[PDB]
Design an enzyme around this catalytic site. Structure first.
Site, short mmCIF file in Angstrom:
data_model
loop_
_atom_site.label_atom_id
_atom_site.label_comp_id
_atom_site.label_asym_id
_atom_site.label_seq_id
_atom_site.Cartn_x
_atom_site.Cartn_y
_atom_site.Cartn_z
N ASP A 130 0.83 -1.21 0.00
CA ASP A 130 0.00 0.00 0.00
C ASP A 130 0.87 1.26 0.00
O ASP A 130 0.52 2.23 -0.67
CB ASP A 130 -0.96 0.01 1.20
CG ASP A 130 -1.96 -1.14 1.23
OD1 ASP A 130 -2.36 -1.62 0.13
OD2 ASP A 130 -2.35 -1.57 2.34
N1 AP5 Z 1 -11.31 -6.06 2.25
C1 AP5 Z 1 -10.45 -5.06 2.48
N2 AP5 Z 1 -10.76 -3.82 2.04
C2 AP5 Z 1 -9.89 -2.83 2.26
N3 AP5 Z 1 -8.71 -2.87 2.88
C3 AP5 Z 1 -8.43 -4.10 3.30
C4 AP5 Z 1 -9.22 -5.23 3.14
N4 AP5 Z 1 -8.59 -6.34 3.69
C5 AP5 Z 1 -7.46 -5.87 4.16
N5 AP5 Z 1 -7.30 -4.52 3.96
C6 AP5 Z 1 -6.23 -3.67 4.49
O1 AP5 Z 1 -4.99 -4.15 4.03
C7 AP5 Z 1 -3.97 -3.70 4.95
C8 AP5 Z 1 -3.01 -4.82 5.22
O2 AP5 Z 1 -2.41 -5.19 3.97
P1 AP5 Z 1 -1.05 -6.02 3.93
O3 AP5 Z 1 -1.31 -7.46 4.15
O4 AP5 Z 1 -0.06 -5.31 4.78
O5 AP5 Z 1 -0.69 -5.81 2.39
P2 AP5 Z 1 0.48 -5.01 1.66
O6 AP5 Z 1 0.54 -3.63 2.18
O7 AP5 Z 1 0.35 -5.24 0.20
O8 AP5 Z 1 1.72 -5.86 2.22
P3 AP5 Z 1 2.28 -7.29 1.76
O9 AP5 Z 1 3.08 -7.88 2.87
O10 AP5 Z 1 1.18 -8.08 1.17
O11 AP5 Z 1 3.27 -6.81 0.60
P4 AP5 Z 1 3.24 -7.05 -0.98
O12 AP5 Z 1 3.42 -8.50 -1.22
O13 AP5 Z 1 2.07 -6.36 -1.57
O14 AP5 Z 1 4.57 -6.27 -1.41
P5 AP5 Z 1 6.06 -6.80 -1.56
O15 AP5 Z 1 6.34 -7.73 -0.44
O16 AP5 Z 1 6.26 -7.28 -2.95
O17 AP5 Z 1 6.91 -5.48 -1.29
C9 AP5 Z 1 6.53 -4.21 -1.87
C10 AP5 Z 1 7.72 -3.29 -1.77
O18 AP5 Z 1 8.22 -3.31 -0.41
C11 AP5 Z 1 9.64 -3.28 -0.40
N6 AP5 Z 1 10.14 -4.51 0.23
C12 AP5 Z 1 9.41 -5.61 0.61
N7 AP5 Z 1 10.14 -6.57 1.13
C13 AP5 Z 1 11.43 -6.06 1.10
C14 AP5 Z 1 12.66 -6.59 1.52
N8 AP5 Z 1 12.81 -7.79 2.10
N9 AP5 Z 1 13.76 -5.82 1.35
C15 AP5 Z 1 13.62 -4.61 0.81
N10 AP5 Z 1 12.51 -4.01 0.37
C16 AP5 Z 1 11.44 -4.79 0.55
C17 AP5 Z 1 10.09 -3.09 -1.85
O19 AP5 Z 1 10.34 -1.73 -2.19
C18 AP5 Z 1 8.91 -3.69 -2.63
O20 AP5 Z 1 8.80 -3.22 -3.97
C19 AP5 Z 1 -4.69 -3.17 6.21
O21 AP5 Z 1 -4.60 -1.75 6.34
C20 AP5 Z 1 -6.13 -3.66 6.01
O22 AP5 Z 1 -7.10 -2.79 6.58
#
Ligand code: AP5
Ligand code: CL
Ligand code: CL
Length: 341
Positions: free
Chosen positions: A296
């Protein structure tokens, strides 16, 4: 200022009820770790069980709200962001209104008379969370509310409009109304894939909205889910990004740019028939506190530069900065002011 209400978001405003739990807690409510689902009747007592814990944290959440919040923070221009959603007439709804004013978002929250504000249980086990969204008032949003002159003015003033795929369960007709307006007014309409269940269960709703999308965001897992649903015999994210961009568009004014994240592996961007990979900010595992809101915040950072008419390299650079900041802190939090230059 010229940026007044330039970015609008529409979605589900949900107060996140987060807590660190054990294997037995997830087995009790039959929830798989590292997966998002919509709350069923059996999951409802779990919200009171989490509320009773000493380690319970309450933070204003919702996928679209988080991205608009991070975009406004990164951008730092007062009055540049707008948000539309539905909340209840209760303590959580007033906390939602309080947080939006502190964040600097012009949130036009429709208050439902009977339903309580939506919640989202964020059960944490190690470094993987289970999200159980009880939408409640967030699920009450109607196209009738969007068409109100006070709410529709935000749609007309905006040039960039973002909606997470999660809102396709609530009101695909409200999504389609702003999407059709954006195509007819050469505006940038954009969406997120949000979760594998959105691609699998809400495939017709997503398929109808996609031709109007100019920037589609997502992670590697939900991109592979999307490819398997449409019968594409491929797991390669680079091939999947081009195939998504290649899909039909309702308006040829803008091309469809597909941005897919791969955690610690480079960001894949399909743009004009060419794939651009961008390595992320290297982070040791000790500093990686929580990946909650990493996706997000990535969208938020991207939107902050997209609003200023910057190139795609600077959109991804700001998207990585915003996500990098959030992962080093508990939840989707960040310092007072950004240090992106
Ligand atoms: N029905 C509904 N309606 C509305 N809202 C709802 C809902 N259900 C749930 N929600 C809401 O959703 C939220 C929780 O969501 P959440 O589960 O936190 O989702 P997210 O923010 O997408 O986090 P993820 O862990 O899923 O990450 P990703 O896989 O998308 O990204 P990536 O790992 O590739 O990483 C992305 C970026 O991160 C960085 N990064 C990640 N890992 C690393 C690493 N190991 N090292 C360096 N940079 C990193 C990089 O820059 C990378 O490009 C809450 O606020 C909740 O209210
Ligand atoms: Cl949302
Ligand atoms: Cl406890």
């Amino acid at each position: 200022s010229g940026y007044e209400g330039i970015l609008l978001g529409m979605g589900n405003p949900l107060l996140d009820i987060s807590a660190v739990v054990d294997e037995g807690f997830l087995a009790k409510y039959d929830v798989k770790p590292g997966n998002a689902i919509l709350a069923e009747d059996k999951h409802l007592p779990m919200y009171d069980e989490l509320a009773s814990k000493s380690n319970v944290e309450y933070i204003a959440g919702g996928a679209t709200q988080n991205s608009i919040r991070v975009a406004q923070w990164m951008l730092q221009i007062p009055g540049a962001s707008s948000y539309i959603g539905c909340i209840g007439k209760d303590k959580f709804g007033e906390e939602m209104k309080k947080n939006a004013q502190a964040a600097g978002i012009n949130a036009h929250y429709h208050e439902d008379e009977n339903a309580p504000t939506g919640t989202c249980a964020v059960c944490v086990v190690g470094g993987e969370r289970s999200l159980i969204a009880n939408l409640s008032a967030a699920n009450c949003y109607k196209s009738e509310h969007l068409k109100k002159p006070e709410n529709w003015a935000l749609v007309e003033k905006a040039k960039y409009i973002y909606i997470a795929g999660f809102f396709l369960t609530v009101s695909p007709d409200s999504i389609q109304l702003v999407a059709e307006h954006a195509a007819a007014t050469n505006k940038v309409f954009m969406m997120n894939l949000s979760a594998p269940f959105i691609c699998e269960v809400f495939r017709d709703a997503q398929e109808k909205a996609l031709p109007y999308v100019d920037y589609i965001f997502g992670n590697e897992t939900e991109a592979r889910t999307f490819a398997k649903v449409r019968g594409w015999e491929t797991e390669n994210v680079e091939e999947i990004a081009l195939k998504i961009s290649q899909l039909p568009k309702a308006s040829g004014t803008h091309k469809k740019i597909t941005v897919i994240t791969q955690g610690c592996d480079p960001v894949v961007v399909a743009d004009d028939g060419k794939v651009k990979t961008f390595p992320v900010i290297l982070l040791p595992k000790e500093k990686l506190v929580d990946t909650n809101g990493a996706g997000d915040a990535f969208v938020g950072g991207f939107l902050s530069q997209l609003v200023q008419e910057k190139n795609i390299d600077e959109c991804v650079r700001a998207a990585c900065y915003a996500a990098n900041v959030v992962i080093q802190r508990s939840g989707c939090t960040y310092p007072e002011k950004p240090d992106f230059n």
